[PDB]
């Protein structure tokens, strides 16, 4: 059940490519994306097509195909 490619784009405009088994949770990636290309974690959010992504979630069970892109934004606070 082979690998697929995934683009993670920051709202600073930075694509970070990733290989992955299609059934594994996105915890592996989300924490790799924080460590490499250093970033908080408990201060961002991930969203495949405006749909939120929890660590639980897998690629297969989100219907992402190859080269599909994931959006990642800072946490947002305001008045």
């Amino acid at each position: 059940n082979d690998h697929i490619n995934l683009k993670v784009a920051g709202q600073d405009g930075s694509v970070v490519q990733f290989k992955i088994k299609r059934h594994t949770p996105l915890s592996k990636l989300m924490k790799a994306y924080c460590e490499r290309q250093g970033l908080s974690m408990r201060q961002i959010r991930f969203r495949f097509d405006g749909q939120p992504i929890n660590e639980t979630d897998t690629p297969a069970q989100l219907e992402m195909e190859d080269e599909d892109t994931i959006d990642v934004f800072q946490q947002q606070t305001g008045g």
Binding site: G13, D71, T77, G78, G79
Partner: protein
């Protein structure tokens, strides 16, 4: 003339505020997650984080489809700006599997640096309206949205949008209520929308904000609006 806050509520709420492991996951709905951290933003006069809004905007959307209420599709928070800054081509796919024209109202929660604000597409009224709780203007926001509609129409329905008759404007400083603190934007913004989605005219002022803060808490965890 609003719901009372019972013994039950106070005791539950007060408990969730008292700090103790902010990672604790204490409400999972709409693929969203609400932690003690997320929920803390409602205490006293804190700054409403994104999670609380998205969640509330989801309940607002759920409480649509209720008989005799304008059907609402509410948007992501990160929507507005990702469009504003990166254009349509970016947010394009965000509305796959949802006809944005199937509903009566679209709900747009907006984050701008320091600020929470709201934009409301009302197909029935055929006008777009921006809502600052501090009466600040954003004529431009609407222009951007109307442009979205234009694009969306072509990308989904494969026809152009009927611009004709449509109004765009932000609401005056005294047309609606004003916030007297620095933190009650997301609070106005949320209650602003609630009020609307019920076709209810705006009732609430600053007065009712402390109460609405409490009440929102309950509404979140239990996933039910009052």
């Amino acid at each position: 003339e609003f719901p009372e806050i019972t013994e039950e509520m106070e005791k539950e709420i007060k408990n969730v505020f008292r700090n103790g492991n902010q990672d604790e996951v204490l409400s999972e709905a709409f693929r969203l997650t609400i932690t003690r951290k997320d929920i803390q933003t409602l205490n006293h006069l804190n700054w409403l984080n994104d999670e609380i809004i998205n969640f509330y905007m989801n309940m607002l959307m759920e409480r649509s489809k209720e008989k005799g209420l304008p059907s609402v599709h509410a948007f992501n928070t990160f929507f507005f700006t990702k469009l504003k800054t990166a254009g349509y081509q970016a947010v394009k796919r965000w509305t796959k599997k949802v006809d944005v024209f199937s509903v009566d109202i679209l709900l747009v929660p907006i984050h701008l640096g320091v600020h929470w604000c709201l934009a409301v597409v009302d197909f029935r009224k055929k006008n777009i309206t921006y809502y600052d709780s501090m009466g600040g203007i954003n004529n431009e926001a609407c222009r951007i949205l109307l442009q979205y509609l234009k694009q969306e129409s072509i990308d989904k329905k494969r026809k152009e949008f009927d611009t004709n008759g449509w109004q765009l404007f932000s609401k005056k400083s005294q047309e609606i209520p004003q916030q007297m603190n620095g933190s009650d934007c997301g609070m106005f913004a949320c209650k602003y929308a609630d009020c609307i989605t019920k076709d209810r005219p705006i009732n609430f002022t600053q007065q009712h904000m402390p109460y609405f803060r409490k009440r929102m808490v309950w509404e979140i965890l239990h996933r039910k609006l009052l």
